[PDB]
């Protein structure tokens, strides 16, 4: 946004060698064993030995900050994302359910998507015209540059790594989205002539015109492909636009500013698992034969309508970070709401271009892998959403504690009780407090952490001594978050410090090929925090095979949880790590509240 204000910002800093390895002991020391504890301390002891290895990959790291505007940017780009092959949908890009509209019927469901639409061309006018109010935290500025990464852009595969598109500012800036309805694809202006954009009446119309040109269910969902692994994707899709008509329709969805799914209609479910499903059909799609075949992954934001009310959506994460997207659905649900102005004579509208898709066996062929690679994937997902109504950000606060942390610190203990012993966790803290920062490692798992833990379930731990523990834990959480934000934490420095040694052409340096940084980066609880206004929350699988993947948004009075596992992994279950987690937060409160401070 604001020029002036981005060239405010600090540029992120290499911390301390020194600093960095003491922290990781650290971290290590509850999920690692004494015997590979004391390895490790010998390892980081000769890694950063006066003239060392580590002493030169740090300079390296040095030199890196003074060239470029964010040291750890295309890095973390490249290895996170772009570099990552499994498929996007479940392990990359997040899903996210928002509260169920209350439209019946086809019309209703238009009307919703219209209006949507236009909620989301009203936030991007301010990306646009860079009106979008500058933010801070704690009296600092917050780097914007987020903001302009997820409007016309679309992930795009590539044989060995794939890469990102974003047209917002280029020669001729799109001025259509993509609608996609029984699988087929449409190319929508809505911008008019003079630059105005179309009001939701108008979109209305225009939406009717794409329902009425895809009646049925009777096109190969091509879409599908998107889901498939990105090494298998890659060949697929460079098959795919080797077709002139093909090639434009990609360029088209590619280009367009956002994509947005009208939904069918898919069959009825038991009440106490809706949830589940719906979470299910805005992280995947349901299925082959419901709407997984009604999307296009690559493309960065998607927003869902559903037939029966509900919507949500899925943002690709190598283009999206949270941030933004959370700006973006609070702006849009309440735009949503906002009373619409009379109705203005309308004018006359064209009919929206279909993208059509030119089938051949390869494709057709490539369109069945998808299918059974995506059944199989969902057919692994095991997904328990948790409405925790007992309490929200409210109870936390009025101890004095930070919701965040809390939540945190349950989620630790209900683990422990699960499975004896704690585990490396992670969490995402934002970077955005440094120029094009995204994000860094806030380890839950701590020395603190499990002397909890382990106390709370400890029939020799006076309840007094629970307490004090849990509050020190939460503390402790509290300030690893603080440390994080303002760029002392340690994962993408070690990170930085391998890449520095790949890029130098150096052997591998042992402290990276030691067993205790295997352990701490296989998170079996990956976990994020959706801080959003509106009553949503998000969800995505685990991030290894024994693993959850928990995402949560704490509101003032209830808490947003979703719980992931894969069923391939018998350790792992869903809905008992939720029952687990809402007792934990529920044992937690009742603790403190029978053992306050003083009078």
């Known amino acids: 946004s604001h020029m002036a204000h981005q060239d405010a910002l600090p540029r992120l800093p290499v911390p301390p060698l020194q600093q960095s390895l003491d922290y990781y002991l650290k971290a290590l020391q509850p999920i690692v064993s004494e015997e590979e504890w004391a390895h490790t301390k010998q390892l980081v002891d000769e890694f950063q030995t006066s003239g060392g290895v580590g002493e030169r990959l740090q300079k390296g790291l040095e030199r890196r900050a003074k060239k470029m505007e964010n040291w750890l940017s295309e890095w973390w780009l490249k290895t996170a994302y772009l570099q990552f092959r499994q498929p996007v949908v479940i392990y990359s890009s997040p899903g996210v359910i928002l509260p169920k509209q209350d439209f019946v019927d086809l019309q209703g469901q238009l009307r919703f998507a219209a209006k949507l639409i236009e909620g989301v061309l009203d936030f991007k006018s301010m990306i646009d015209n860079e009106t979008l109010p500058v933010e801070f935290l704690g009296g600092q500025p917050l780097c914007?540059?987020?903001?302009?990464?997820?409007?016309?852009?679309?992930?795009?595969?590539?044989?060995?790594?794939?890469?990102?598109?974003?047209?917002?500012?280029?020669?001729?800036?799109?001025?259509?989205?993509?609608?996609?309805?029984?699988?087929?694809?449409?190319?929508?202006?809505?911008?008019?002539?003079?630059?105005?954009?179309?009001?939701?009446?108008?979109?209305?119309?225009?939406?009717?015109?794409?329902?009425?040109?895809?009646?049925?269910?009777?096109?190969?969902?091509?879409?599908?492909?998107?889901?498939?692994?990105?090494?298998?994707?890659?060949?697929?899709?460079?098959?795919?636009?080797?077709?002139?008509?093909?090639?434009?329709?990609?360029?088209?969805?590619?280009?367009?500013?956002?994509?947005?799914?009208?939904?069918?209609?898919?069959?009825?479910?038991?009440?106490?698992?809706?949830?589940?499903?719906?979470?299910?059909?805005?992280?995947?799609?349901?299925?082959?034969?419901?709407?997984?075949?009604?999307?296009?992954?690559?493309?960065?934001?998607?927003?869902?309508?559903?037939?029966?009310?509900?919507?949500?959506?899925?943002?690709?994460?190598?283009?999206a970070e949270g941030p933004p997207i959370v700006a973006?659905?609070?702006?849009?649900?309440?735009?949503?709401?906002?009373?619409?102005?009379?109705?203005?004579?309308?004018?006359?509208?064209?009919?929206?271009?279909?993208?059509?898709?030119?089938?051949?066996?390869?494709?057709?062929?490539?369109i069945e892998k998808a299918k059974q690679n995506l059944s199989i994937m969902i057919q692994d997902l095991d997904i328990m959403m948790l409405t925790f109504h007992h309490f929200g950000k409210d109870f936390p606060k009025s101890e004095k504690l930070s919701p965040d942390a809390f939540i945190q610190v349950a989620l630790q203990l209900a683990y422990y009780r699960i499975y004896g012993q704690a585990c490396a966790t992670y969490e995402s803290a934002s970077l955005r407090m440094f120029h094009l920062g995204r994000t860094d490692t806030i380890r839950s798992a701590s020395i603190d952490s499990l002397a909890f833990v382990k106390g709370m379930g400890d029939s020799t731990v006076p309840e007094q001594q629970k307490v004090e523990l849990l509050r020190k834990a939460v503390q402790a959480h509290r300030a690893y978050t603080d440390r994080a934000i303002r760029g002392e934490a340690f994962d993408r420095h070690l990170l930085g410090l391998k890449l520095q040694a790949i890029e130098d052409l150096v052997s591998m340096p042992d402290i990276f090929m030691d067993t205790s940084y295997a352990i701490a980066m296989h998170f079996n609880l990956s976990t994020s925090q959706v801080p959003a206004k509106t009553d949503c929350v998000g969800f995505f699988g685990p991030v290894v095979p024994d693993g959850y993947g928990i995402c949560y948004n704490p509101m003032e009075a209830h808490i947003n949880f979703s719980v992931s596992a894969y069923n391939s992994c018998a350790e792992t279950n869903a809905a008992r790590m939720a029952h687990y987690l809402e007792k934990a937060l529920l044992d937690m409160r009742t603790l403190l509240q029978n053992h306050p401070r003083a009078k």
């Open 328 to 366: 973006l659905v609070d702006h849009v649900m309440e735009y949503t709401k906002k009373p619409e102005l009379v109705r203005s004579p309308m004018v006359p509208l064209p009919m929206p271009k279909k993208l059509r898709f030119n089938i051949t066996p390869e494709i057709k062929n490539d």
């Open 144 to 319: 914007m540059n987020q903001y302009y990464q997820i409007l016309s852009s679309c992930r795009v595969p590539g044989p060995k790594q794939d890469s990102v598109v974003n047209f917002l500012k280029s020669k001729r800036p799109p001025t259509h989205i993509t609608v996609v309805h029984n699988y087929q694809f449409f190319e929508l202006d809505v911008y008019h002539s003079d630059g105005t954009p179309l009001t939701s009446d108008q979109i209305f119309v225009q939406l009717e015109k794409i329902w009425n040109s895809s009646l049925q269910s009777n096109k190969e969902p091509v879409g599908i492909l998107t889901s498939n692994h990105r090494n298998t994707w890659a060949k697929a899709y460079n098959n795919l636009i080797k077709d002139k008509v093909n090639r434009e329709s990609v360029n088209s969805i590619q280009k367009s500013i956002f994509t947005v799914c009208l939904d069918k209609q898919v069959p009825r479910v038991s009440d106490d698992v809706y949830r589940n499903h719906v979470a299910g059909q805005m992280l995947h799609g349901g299925g082959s034969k419901f709407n997984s075949g009604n999307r296009w992954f690559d493309k960065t934001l998607q927003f869902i309508v559903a037939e029966d009310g509900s919507c949500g959506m899925v943002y690709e994460h190598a283009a």
